[PDB]
Short mmCIF file of C-alpha atoms and ligand atoms in Angstrom, two decimals:
data_model
loop_
_atom_site.label_atom_id
_atom_site.label_comp_id
_atom_site.label_asym_id
_atom_site.label_seq_id
_atom_site.Cartn_x
_atom_site.Cartn_y
_atom_site.Cartn_z
CA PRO M 1 199.10 260.24 66.28
CA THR M 2 198.05 263.71 65.11
CA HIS M 3 199.57 266.25 67.57
CA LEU M 4 202.69 266.17 69.85
CA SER M 5 201.79 264.39 73.14
CA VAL M 6 202.36 266.65 76.19
CA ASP M 7 203.79 263.51 77.91
CA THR M 8 206.62 263.31 75.26
CA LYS M 9 210.09 263.84 76.82
CA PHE M 10 211.87 267.16 76.28
CA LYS M 11 215.70 267.07 76.46
CA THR M 12 216.72 269.87 78.89
CA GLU M 13 220.54 269.96 78.45
CA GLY M 14 220.32 273.12 76.26
CA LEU M 15 218.35 274.87 79.04
CA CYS M 16 220.62 274.20 82.04
CA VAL M 17 222.98 277.25 81.71
CA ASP M 18 220.00 279.72 81.95
CA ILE M 19 218.10 277.26 84.25
CA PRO M 20 220.67 275.52 86.52
CA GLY M 21 219.42 272.42 88.33
CA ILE M 22 216.72 271.70 85.69
CA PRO M 23 215.64 268.01 85.79
CA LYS M 24 217.01 265.79 83.06
CA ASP M 25 213.63 263.96 83.06
CA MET M 26 211.07 266.45 81.78
CA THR M 27 207.86 266.27 79.70
CA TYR M 28 206.19 269.01 77.63
CA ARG M 29 203.42 268.97 80.33
CA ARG M 30 205.91 269.86 83.08
CA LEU M 31 207.85 272.34 80.85
CA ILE M 32 204.62 274.21 79.91
CA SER M 33 203.75 274.44 83.64
CA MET M 34 207.29 275.73 84.44
CA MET M 35 206.77 278.40 81.71
CA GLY M 36 203.80 279.69 83.81
CA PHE M 37 201.00 278.28 81.63
CA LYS M 38 198.07 276.22 82.97
CA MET M 39 196.45 273.88 80.41
CA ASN M 40 193.61 272.87 82.91
CA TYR M 41 192.94 269.47 81.09
CA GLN M 42 191.39 271.11 78.01
CA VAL M 43 190.00 269.35 74.87
CA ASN M 44 189.52 272.54 72.84
CA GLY M 45 191.75 272.36 69.73
CA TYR M 46 194.98 273.38 71.55
CA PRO M 47 196.47 270.14 73.06
CA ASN M 48 200.06 271.41 73.23
CA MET M 49 201.91 274.76 72.74
CA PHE M 50 204.69 272.66 71.08
CA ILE M 51 204.24 270.87 67.77
CA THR M 52 205.79 267.99 65.79
CA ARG M 53 208.35 268.54 62.98
CA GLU M 54 205.66 267.28 60.52
CA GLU M 55 203.17 269.90 61.84
CA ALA M 56 205.88 272.62 61.62
CA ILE M 57 206.49 271.69 57.94
CA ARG M 58 202.76 271.90 57.14
CA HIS M 59 202.81 275.42 58.69
CA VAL M 60 206.15 276.71 57.32
CA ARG M 61 204.48 280.09 56.35
CA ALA M 62 203.86 280.66 60.11
CA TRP M 63 207.55 280.26 61.08
CA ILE M 64 209.15 283.10 63.01
CA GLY M 65 212.57 282.49 64.52
CA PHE M 66 212.71 283.77 68.09
CA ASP M 67 215.60 284.20 70.48
CA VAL M 68 215.99 285.90 73.86
CA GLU M 69 219.36 287.02 75.13
CA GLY M 70 219.73 288.05 78.76
CA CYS M 71 221.12 291.57 78.00
CA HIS M 72 222.48 291.77 81.59
CA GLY M 73 215.36 287.65 84.25
CA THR M 74 213.46 289.44 87.11
CA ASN M 75 216.30 291.98 87.60
CA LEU M 76 217.95 292.14 84.13
CA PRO M 77 216.83 293.57 80.76
CA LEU M 78 216.21 291.04 77.94
CA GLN M 79 216.91 291.45 74.21
CA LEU M 80 214.09 289.81 72.22
CA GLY M 81 215.08 288.96 68.67
CA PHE M 82 212.89 287.82 65.77
CA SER M 83 213.68 286.41 62.28
CA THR M 84 212.02 289.61 60.85
CA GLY M 85 215.30 291.35 61.96
CA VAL M 86 213.65 293.13 64.90
CA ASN M 87 215.37 293.40 68.33
CA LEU M 88 213.26 294.74 71.23
CA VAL M 89 214.75 295.39 74.67
CA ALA M 90 212.35 294.61 77.55
CA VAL M 91 213.11 296.02 81.01
CA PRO M 92 211.31 294.53 84.06
CA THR M 93 210.89 297.99 85.74
CA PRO M 94 219.26 294.58 62.41
CA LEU M 95 216.67 297.01 63.91
CA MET M 96 217.70 297.81 67.53
CA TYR M 97 215.09 299.38 69.88
CA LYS M 98 215.75 300.91 73.36
CA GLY M 99 214.69 299.41 76.76
CA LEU M 100 210.94 299.54 77.50
CA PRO M 101 208.54 297.79 79.92
CA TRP M 102 206.67 294.64 78.91
CA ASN M 103 203.24 296.37 78.69
CA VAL M 104 204.50 298.34 75.64
CA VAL M 105 206.87 295.61 74.24
CA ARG M 106 203.88 293.20 73.98
CA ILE M 107 201.93 295.76 71.82
CA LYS M 108 204.91 295.94 69.39
CA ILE M 109 205.18 292.09 69.25
CA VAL M 110 201.48 291.81 68.29
CA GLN M 111 201.78 294.57 65.56
CA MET M 112 204.98 293.01 64.09
CA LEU M 113 203.60 289.41 63.96
CA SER M 114 200.22 290.57 62.57
CA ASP M 115 201.83 292.62 59.77
CA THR M 116 204.27 289.81 58.92
CA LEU M 117 201.75 286.92 59.01
CA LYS M 118 198.30 288.28 58.01
CA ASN M 119 198.85 287.37 54.30
CA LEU M 120 200.83 284.15 55.04
CA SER M 121 199.18 282.07 57.75
CA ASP M 122 196.33 281.53 60.22
CA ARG M 123 198.93 281.18 63.08
CA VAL M 124 202.51 281.73 64.38
CA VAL M 125 205.14 278.98 64.95
CA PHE M 126 208.02 280.32 67.07
CA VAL M 127 211.16 278.50 65.89
CA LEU M 128 213.60 278.22 68.78
CA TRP M 129 217.13 277.03 69.62
CA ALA M 130 215.96 276.93 73.24
CA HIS M 131 218.35 277.86 76.05
CA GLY M 132 215.82 279.07 78.70
CA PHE M 133 215.18 282.87 78.68
CA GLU M 134 212.95 282.66 75.56
CA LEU M 135 210.66 280.06 77.16
CA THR M 136 210.45 281.95 80.47
CA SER M 137 209.74 285.29 78.69
CA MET M 138 206.68 283.86 76.85
CA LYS M 139 204.34 284.48 79.84
CA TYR M 140 204.93 288.23 79.39
CA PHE M 141 203.34 288.40 75.90
CA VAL M 142 201.41 285.11 75.42
CA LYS M 143 197.91 284.09 76.57
CA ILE M 144 196.52 280.59 75.97
CA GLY M 145 193.07 278.97 76.11
CA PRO M 146 190.47 277.23 73.95
CA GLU M 147 190.59 277.72 70.17
CA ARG M 148 188.59 280.84 69.29
CA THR M 149 187.43 282.88 66.32
CA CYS M 150 188.04 286.55 65.46
CA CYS M 151 185.59 289.16 66.83
CA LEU M 152 185.35 290.79 63.34
CA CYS M 153 185.60 287.70 61.04
CA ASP M 154 185.46 283.84 60.77
CA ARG M 155 189.28 283.35 60.95
CA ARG M 156 190.87 281.66 64.00
CA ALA M 157 192.00 284.03 66.77
CA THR M 158 195.73 284.79 67.05
CA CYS M 159 195.65 287.84 69.39
CA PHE M 160 193.91 288.91 72.60
CA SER M 161 193.17 292.38 73.98
CA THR M 162 193.10 293.06 77.76
CA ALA M 163 191.58 296.52 77.04
CA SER M 164 188.42 295.14 75.35
CA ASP M 165 188.47 291.47 76.54
CA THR M 166 188.14 290.40 72.85
CA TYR M 167 190.00 288.16 70.34
CA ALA M 168 191.21 288.89 66.83
CA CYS M 169 193.01 287.28 63.86
CA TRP M 170 196.22 288.84 62.30
CA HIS M 171 194.04 291.14 60.04
CA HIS M 172 191.93 292.70 62.87
CA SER M 173 194.36 292.97 65.79
CA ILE M 174 195.24 296.70 65.74
CA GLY M 175 195.70 297.79 69.37
CA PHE M 176 195.81 294.18 70.68
CA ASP M 177 198.42 293.44 73.38
CA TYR M 178 198.71 289.59 73.66
CA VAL M 179 199.74 286.79 71.28
CA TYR M 180 196.99 284.17 71.68
CA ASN M 181 197.49 280.37 71.27
CA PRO M 182 200.86 280.57 69.43
CA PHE M 183 202.77 277.39 68.48
CA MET M 184 206.46 276.64 68.97
CA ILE M 185 209.20 274.13 68.15
CA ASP M 186 212.65 273.68 69.67
CA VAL M 187 215.14 272.78 66.86
CA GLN M 188 217.61 271.70 69.58
CA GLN M 189 215.23 268.68 70.21
CA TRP M 190 216.10 267.22 66.77
CA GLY M 191 219.55 265.90 67.70
CA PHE M 192 222.43 268.28 67.09
CA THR M 193 226.04 268.34 68.29
CA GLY M 194 227.44 271.75 69.14
CA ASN M 195 225.90 275.22 69.23
CA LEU M 196 223.55 277.06 66.82
CA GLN M 197 226.30 278.96 64.91
CA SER M 198 228.39 275.82 64.17
CA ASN M 199 225.37 273.87 62.84
CA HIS M 200 223.94 276.83 60.82
CA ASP M 201 227.36 277.72 59.27
CA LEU M 202 227.81 274.17 57.92
CA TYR M 203 225.06 274.97 55.35
CA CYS M 204 224.86 278.78 55.13
CA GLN M 205 227.30 281.63 54.48
CA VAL M 206 224.69 284.43 54.03
CA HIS M 207 223.60 284.92 57.67
CA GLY M 208 226.32 286.21 59.97
CA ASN M 209 226.37 286.46 63.77
CA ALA M 210 226.43 290.14 64.70
CA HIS M 211 225.95 288.73 68.31
CA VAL M 212 222.37 290.08 68.64
CA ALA M 213 219.18 288.11 69.36
CA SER M 214 217.68 288.70 65.86
CA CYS M 215 220.84 287.15 64.26
CA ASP M 216 220.29 283.97 66.34
CA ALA M 217 216.54 284.02 65.48
CA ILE M 218 217.40 284.22 61.73
CA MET M 219 220.04 281.44 61.96
CA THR M 220 217.57 279.19 63.90
CA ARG M 221 214.79 279.55 61.28
CA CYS M 222 217.44 279.13 58.48
CA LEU M 223 218.76 275.87 60.08
CA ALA M 224 215.13 274.64 60.45
CA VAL M 225 214.39 275.42 56.74
CA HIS M 226 217.64 273.58 55.76
CA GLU M 227 216.69 270.43 57.70
CA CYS M 228 213.06 270.39 56.59
CA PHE M 229 213.25 271.61 52.95
CA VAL M 230 216.89 271.33 51.78
CA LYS M 231 218.31 268.00 53.05
CA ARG M 232 214.79 266.51 53.42
CA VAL M 233 212.17 267.05 50.67
CA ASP M 234 208.49 266.09 50.91
CA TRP M 235 206.53 266.91 47.72
CA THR M 236 203.34 265.15 49.03
CA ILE M 237 202.56 268.11 51.36
CA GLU M 238 199.93 270.42 49.91
CA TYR M 239 199.73 274.07 51.07
CA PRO M 240 196.60 276.29 51.09
CA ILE M 241 195.88 278.97 48.45
CA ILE M 242 196.82 282.37 49.97
CA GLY M 243 197.18 284.55 46.84
CA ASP M 244 197.54 284.36 43.05
CA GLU M 245 198.74 280.69 42.94
CA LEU M 246 196.20 279.58 40.31
CA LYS M 247 196.65 282.60 38.00
CA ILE M 248 200.45 282.30 38.25
CA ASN M 249 200.43 278.55 37.47
CA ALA M 250 198.03 279.07 34.51
CA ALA M 251 200.19 281.96 33.21
CA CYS M 252 203.28 279.68 33.49
CA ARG M 253 201.62 277.04 31.26
CA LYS M 254 200.50 279.74 28.72
CA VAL M 255 203.93 281.44 28.54
CA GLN M 256 205.75 278.08 28.24
CA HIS M 257 203.57 276.98 25.29
CA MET M 258 203.95 280.41 23.61
CA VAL M 259 207.74 280.67 23.93
CA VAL M 260 208.55 277.09 22.99
CA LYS M 261 206.11 277.10 20.04
CA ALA M 262 207.69 280.35 18.71
CA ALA M 263 211.29 279.12 19.16
CA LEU M 264 210.43 275.97 17.18
CA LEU M 265 208.75 278.06 14.41
CA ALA M 266 211.52 280.70 14.26
CA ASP M 267 214.53 278.33 14.19
CA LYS M 268 212.99 274.97 13.09
CA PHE M 269 215.05 272.76 15.46
CA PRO M 270 214.80 269.07 14.52
CA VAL M 271 215.10 267.95 18.22
CA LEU M 272 214.11 269.43 21.65
CA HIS M 273 215.68 268.10 24.92
CA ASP M 274 213.23 268.72 27.75
CA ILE M 275 215.26 268.63 31.01
CA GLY M 276 213.46 268.62 34.35
CA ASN M 277 210.15 267.44 35.86
CA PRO M 278 209.91 263.63 35.46
CA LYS M 279 206.15 264.14 34.98
CA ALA M 280 206.49 266.73 32.19
CA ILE M 281 204.07 266.72 29.28
CA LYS M 282 204.89 268.09 25.75
CA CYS M 283 204.10 271.84 26.11
CA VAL M 284 203.59 272.14 22.28
CA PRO M 285 201.94 268.81 21.30
CA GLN M 286 201.35 269.78 17.65
CA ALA M 287 205.07 270.59 16.94
CA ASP M 288 206.91 268.50 14.30
CA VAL M 289 210.08 268.19 16.47
CA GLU M 290 211.58 265.02 17.99
CA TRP M 291 210.72 265.59 21.68
CA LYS M 292 213.07 263.82 24.15
CA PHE M 293 212.63 264.01 27.98
CA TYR M 294 215.33 263.83 30.72
CA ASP M 295 214.37 263.46 34.37
CA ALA M 296 215.60 265.83 37.03
CA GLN M 297 213.75 266.67 40.25
CA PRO M 298 214.10 270.32 41.51
CA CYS M 299 217.53 270.88 43.09
CA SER M 300 216.83 272.25 46.58
CA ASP M 301 220.46 272.64 47.75
CA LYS M 302 222.91 273.86 45.05
CA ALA M 303 222.04 274.34 41.34
CA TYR M 304 222.79 271.23 39.19
CA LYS M 305 226.25 271.22 37.62
CA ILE M 306 225.69 271.06 33.82
CA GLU M 307 228.62 268.60 33.54
CA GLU M 308 227.00 266.22 36.06
CA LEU M 309 223.57 266.26 34.30
CA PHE M 310 224.00 264.34 30.95
CA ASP M 311 222.18 269.64 18.66
CA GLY M 312 218.71 271.18 18.50
CA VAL M 313 217.42 273.06 21.53
CA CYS M 314 217.38 272.44 25.32
CA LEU M 315 214.36 273.37 27.42
CA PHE M 316 215.10 274.00 31.14
CA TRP M 317 211.71 274.99 32.62
CA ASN M 318 212.57 275.58 36.30
CA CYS M 319 215.44 273.01 36.11
CA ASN M 320 218.10 275.13 37.82
CA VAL M 321 221.63 274.63 36.45
CA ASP M 322 224.91 276.46 37.20
CA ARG M 323 225.58 277.45 33.54
CA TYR M 324 223.05 276.95 30.76
CA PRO M 325 224.21 275.74 27.33
CA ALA M 326 223.98 278.40 24.58
CA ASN M 327 221.23 276.43 22.73
CA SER M 328 218.63 276.87 25.55
CA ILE M 329 215.06 278.13 26.36
CA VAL M 330 215.05 278.84 30.13
CA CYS M 331 212.62 279.72 32.95
CA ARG M 332 214.52 280.43 36.23
CA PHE M 333 212.82 281.56 39.46
CA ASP M 334 214.48 284.68 40.92
CA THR M 335 214.87 283.93 44.65
CA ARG M 336 215.27 287.65 45.49
CA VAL M 337 211.59 288.37 44.59
CA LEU M 338 209.41 289.88 47.35
CA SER M 339 206.01 288.10 47.54
CA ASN M 340 203.65 286.26 49.93
CA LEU M 341 204.56 282.99 48.10
CA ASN M 342 208.35 283.41 48.50
CA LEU M 343 209.76 282.94 52.04
CA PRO M 344 213.42 283.61 53.04
CA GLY M 345 215.55 280.50 52.65
CA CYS M 346 218.96 278.91 53.31
CA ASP M 347 222.32 280.15 51.87
CA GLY M 348 220.77 282.86 49.60
CA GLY M 349 218.06 280.47 48.44
CA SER M 350 214.36 281.00 48.99
CA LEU M 351 211.40 278.80 49.85
CA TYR M 352 208.78 279.16 47.07
CA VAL M 353 205.45 277.90 48.37
CA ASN M 354 202.79 277.48 45.68
CA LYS M 355 200.76 274.26 46.20
CA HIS M 356 204.09 272.61 47.16
CA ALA M 357 207.22 273.94 48.94
CA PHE M 358 210.27 274.32 46.70
CA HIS M 359 213.55 275.39 48.30
CA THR M 360 215.29 277.10 45.36
CA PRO M 361 219.04 277.80 45.16
CA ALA M 362 220.14 281.44 45.04
CA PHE M 363 219.54 283.30 41.77
CA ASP M 364 222.87 283.80 40.01
CA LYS M 365 223.17 286.08 36.93
CA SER M 366 226.27 284.17 35.76
CA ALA M 367 224.11 281.06 34.99
CA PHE M 368 222.85 282.92 31.87
CA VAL M 369 226.16 284.08 30.27
CA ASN M 370 225.54 282.08 27.03
CA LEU M 371 221.96 283.42 26.68
CA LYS M 372 220.01 286.72 26.63
CA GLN M 373 216.77 287.84 28.33
CA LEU M 374 213.70 286.69 26.42
CA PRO M 375 211.79 289.82 25.24
CA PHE M 376 207.99 290.01 25.57
CA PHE M 377 206.02 289.05 22.43
CA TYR M 378 202.65 287.54 21.57
CA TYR M 379 202.44 285.12 18.63
CA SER M 380 199.30 283.59 17.09
CA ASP M 381 198.51 281.73 13.89
CA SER M 382 194.80 281.25 14.84
CA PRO M 383 192.16 282.65 12.41
CA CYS M 384 191.10 286.29 12.84
CA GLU M 385 187.55 285.86 14.16
CA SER M 386 185.80 287.49 17.19
CA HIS M 387 183.26 284.72 18.23
CA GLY M 388 181.09 285.60 21.25
CA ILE M 389 184.20 292.69 26.80
CA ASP M 390 184.45 296.21 25.29
CA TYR M 391 187.16 297.40 22.81
CA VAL M 392 189.87 300.06 22.10
CA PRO M 393 192.01 299.42 18.95
CA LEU M 394 195.34 297.72 19.71
CA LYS M 395 198.56 299.06 18.20
CA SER M 396 201.68 297.01 19.09
CA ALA M 397 204.92 296.05 17.36
CA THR M 398 204.96 292.79 19.48
CA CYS M 399 201.52 291.44 18.39
CA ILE M 400 202.89 288.90 15.90
CA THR M 401 199.67 288.05 14.01
CA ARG M 402 198.41 287.93 10.36
CA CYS M 403 196.15 290.94 11.05
CA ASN M 404 199.05 293.06 12.39
CA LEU M 405 201.18 291.99 9.37
CA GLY M 406 198.25 293.24 7.21
CA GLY M 407 198.39 296.56 9.10
CA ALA M 408 195.48 296.34 11.63
CA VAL M 409 195.05 294.03 14.70
CA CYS M 410 191.61 292.31 14.73
CA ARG M 411 189.40 292.30 17.90
CA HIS M 412 190.06 288.58 18.67
CA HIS M 413 193.86 288.97 18.51
CA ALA M 414 193.69 292.24 20.53
CA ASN M 415 191.69 290.47 23.33
CA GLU M 416 194.11 287.49 23.26
CA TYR M 417 197.17 289.81 23.23
CA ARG M 418 195.95 291.72 26.32
CA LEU M 419 195.09 288.49 28.19
CA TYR M 420 198.55 287.11 27.30
CA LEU M 421 200.24 290.32 28.45
CA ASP M 422 198.33 290.07 31.78
CA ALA M 423 199.44 286.41 32.18
CA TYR M 424 203.06 287.33 31.27
CA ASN M 425 203.21 290.26 33.76
CA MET M 426 201.69 288.02 36.48
CA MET M 427 204.37 285.29 35.97
CA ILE M 428 207.24 287.84 35.86
CA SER M 429 206.03 289.68 38.97
CA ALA M 430 205.74 286.27 40.76
CA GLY M 431 209.57 286.05 40.31
CA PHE M 432 210.08 283.97 37.16
CA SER M 433 212.72 285.12 34.66
CA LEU M 434 212.99 284.01 31.01
CA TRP M 435 216.10 283.49 28.94
CA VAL M 436 216.78 282.31 25.40
CA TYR M 437 219.54 281.47 22.87
CA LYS M 438 221.09 284.69 21.41
CA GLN M 439 219.92 283.96 17.82
CA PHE M 440 216.21 284.11 18.91
CA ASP M 441 214.53 286.77 16.77
CA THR M 442 210.76 287.37 16.56
CA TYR M 443 211.30 288.90 13.06
CA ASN M 444 211.55 285.23 11.90
CA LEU M 445 207.90 284.63 12.96
CA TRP M 446 206.36 287.03 10.39
CA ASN M 447 207.23 284.61 7.51
CA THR M 448 205.07 281.87 9.11
CA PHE M 449 202.16 283.98 7.53
CA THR M 450 202.65 283.31 3.78
C1 LIG R 1 212.55 270.81 37.47
C2 LIG R 1 211.24 270.60 38.18
C3 LIG R 1 210.85 269.34 38.59
C4 LIG R 1 209.64 269.13 39.22
C5 LIG R 1 208.80 270.20 39.47
C6 LIG R 1 209.19 271.49 39.12
N1 LIG R 1 208.24 272.51 39.36
C7 LIG R 1 208.37 273.82 39.71
N2 LIG R 1 207.28 274.60 39.59
C8 LIG R 1 207.34 275.88 39.97
N3 LIG R 1 208.36 276.53 40.53
C9 LIG R 1 209.43 275.74 40.70
C10 LIG R 1 209.52 274.39 40.34
C11 LIG R 1 210.84 274.04 40.68
N4 LIG R 1 211.52 275.06 41.19
N5 LIG R 1 210.64 276.12 41.19
C12 LIG R 1 211.02 277.43 41.72
C13 LIG R 1 210.38 271.67 38.42
ZN1 LIG R 2 189.47 288.79 61.81
ZN1 LIG R 3 221.42 281.00 57.13
ZN1 LIG R 4 193.72 288.78 13.97
#
């Protein structure tokens, strides 16, 4: 069992107000045919327009909530809403566009999807709370067929052009008019009682219902993220590299070692309490400190209450708590960050996808009231020696080295400082924020050179 069988039953109760008389007994095969699509018994990488929940989770970066509201359906205009916030009105003759024929609406759909998804995914997964009009509107902007490649590159085709009779991926589809071989999933098939708003509002207070199609599209994708990444968590699923994942992860390890090593040198804590990842390793293995570990998996719903969790210093490296103790070293992902790795999430939270998917609770400035922002600094006690890249003399008050103490930064420590600054800026721009106990002072590191 790899894909969703077309002979699987599709519950049609949610469709019967828009489609009265619809059979209760219905397969994906018959539904796809009713939607105006002919599959022609094809064994060419596209067995079904609909996909399993497991396949949707593997392709979370492709998810686009989609809703169609019958604005007045052959004779009536339709409001097409997307989880990007776009509302397009299609006439059969929070961004709200005026009524236009399908031949121009389809061009906009292709541009919008291509700009949203080109740096995220090789496909689109339309996330529905299906009532009928959305499924029957698909024929006006979707073409299907065998799996194909782009006319300008090796990527799989996501768009088709009637003007040129060619196929393109999301990066090369300028001027294309049809969405080609999209995927879709009906959330309503998962077993819910009551309408979209009542189920969404049980878990989220951030998305309202301004009664437009884009609001429903947003709520649908939000509910789907909640079910698949908040209440259910699968950390075995690996996601492809689409950006700076490796540099960010390597910068995270470098910054963690730097900051913890300096805090231990500056304040000489006898014990460190490492709270988080049950598979954590000592980030400063040469430190004299009594290192004690406490297991906590990432909280994907609400931040851990400090009282419900369980002297010296506490290390919370991505272990999200409601209020950090004053004696802490903290790395907290800022959910508001705009990046190709960070997808919109549930109840203010965000879905951070870097090797694994981590639904992260909303960033809250009040968690850090007992702490202060950790300032940038570079510390090194390694010998001053080049060994082995051109040079311009480094002058910096934050290069905490023996050579800078002696009045002149050596070439080795200048190269290491600049590499560290690049790693630091990478990690910060990825959305990570750093916080520390108020007594932390880098002036206390200079006396480690005596
Ligand atoms: C506390 C903990 C346990 C297990 C793994 C991780 N790893 C993480 N690595 C990177 N980003 C993360 C996370 C958790 N959240 N966010 C946002 C953290
Ligand atoms: Zn291409
Ligand atoms: Zn929501
Ligand atoms: Zn030096």
